[PDB]
């Protein structure tokens, strides 16, 4: 039975987490994204100038082309990418998926053009939302699932320290106490779960649903929740330069917690201080608006506090505080 551990590393300020992936022999640094189901990489089909500062896949060397197949995706922050498709061998922490679909980029928007931290994305959402046409493909995880000792993956993202992606097994030394599981609704292809209530500092409110997303930097919530949080932070103000609410870096921030199937998942105020807003004496808040999309995004800020198990049986998500 297979299992493996892939180590991830945060970029500056924990903006993204990258992990090495070997495709047809070439190792690329990819961003693992539980909010999407496409495995796409920078490739030799891009203009030479866009290949700059990246490790690129050369499909011709080892890939098998799926003639006539295309892919095209748009993300939550305005970024998009499109290309063609090949199958190849994809290895992550010693687990190899043979015949995995690899989405080679032919076009990428400026956001990706400018980010030299990653060489593409490895999607870990449910395969129902893979964008390949005319026939969608399975994610790396769906591809190898049946060969793993357990059909699950778990993640420990950390603040400015290496973390891990555990494939096929649970590492009990990564958390304190026991895991608490909650059911997942994968009808929209996400690892979606329900929270029973939340507590923002001194104020508690009704529950809502959200997705566990390693590919989102912040904790994105409903504007009402964001207001209630920042109403308790002296001097908090929005700064479009920074990207949302900013405050004096020395501010004492309230904790944020959600109650999930009886378990209280707490994000300590120190983790809500994302970092220097990169403009004067302020820091960006780790809690920001979800722009009225109707569900919350439990991004890295939230994940840095927990060890999370993504279990295909259920499906369900288990949570415990990181050790």
């Amino acid at each position: 039975a297979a299992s493996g551990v892939a180590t991830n590393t945060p970029t500056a300020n924990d903006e993204e987490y990258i992990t090495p992936v070997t495709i047809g022999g070439t190792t690329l640094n990819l961003n693992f994204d539980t909010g999407s189901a496409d495995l796409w990489v920078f490739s030799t089909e891009l203009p030479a100038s866009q290949q700059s500062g990246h490790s690129v896949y050369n499909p011709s060397a080892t890939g098998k082309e799926l003639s006539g197949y295309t892919w095209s995706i748009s993300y939550g922050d305005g970024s998009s990418a499109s290309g063609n498709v090949f199958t190849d061998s994809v290895t992550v922490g010693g687990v190899t998926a043979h015949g995995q679909a690899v989405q080679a980029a032919q076009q990428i928007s400026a956001q990706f053009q400018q980010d030299t931290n990653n060489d593409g994305l490895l999607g870990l959402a449910f395969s129902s939302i893979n964008t390949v046409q005319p026939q969608s493909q399975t994610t790396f995880f769906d591809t190898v699932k049946s060969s793993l000792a357990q059909p699950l993956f778990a993640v420990a993202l950390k603040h400015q320290q290496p973390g891990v992606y555990d494939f096929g097994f649970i590492d009990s030394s990564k958390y304190t106490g026991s895991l608490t599981y909650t059911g997942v609704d994968n009808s929209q292809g996400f690892w979606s779960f329900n929270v029973d209530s939340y507590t923002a500092g001194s104020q508690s409110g009704d529950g809502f649903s959200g997705i566990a997303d390693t590919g989102t930097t912040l904790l994105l919530l409903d504007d009402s929740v964001v207001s209630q949080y920042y109403s308790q932070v002296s001097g908090a103000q929005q700064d479009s330069n920074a990207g949302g609410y900013v405050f004096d870096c020395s501010t004492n921030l309230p904790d944020f917690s959600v109650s999930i199937s009886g378990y209280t998942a707490t994000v300590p105020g120190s983790l809500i201080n994302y970092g220097p807003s990169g403009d004067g004496s302020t820091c960006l808040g780790g809690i920001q608006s979800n722009s009225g999309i109707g569900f919350s995004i439990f991004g890295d800020i939230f994940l840095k506090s927990q060890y999370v198990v993504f279990d295909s049986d259920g499906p369900q998500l288990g949570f415990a505080p990181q050790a």
């Binding site: 903006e15 993204e16 961003n31 693992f32 994204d33 539980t34 909010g35 999407s36 993300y75 939550g76 922050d77 970024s79 956001q111 994305l121 997303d213 390693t214 590919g215 989102t216 930097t217 912040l218 994105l220 990207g243 995004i297 991004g299």
Partner: peptide, 4 residues
């Protein structure tokens, strides 16, 4: 930051 980003929103995947």
């Amino acid at each position: 930051x980003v929103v995947x």
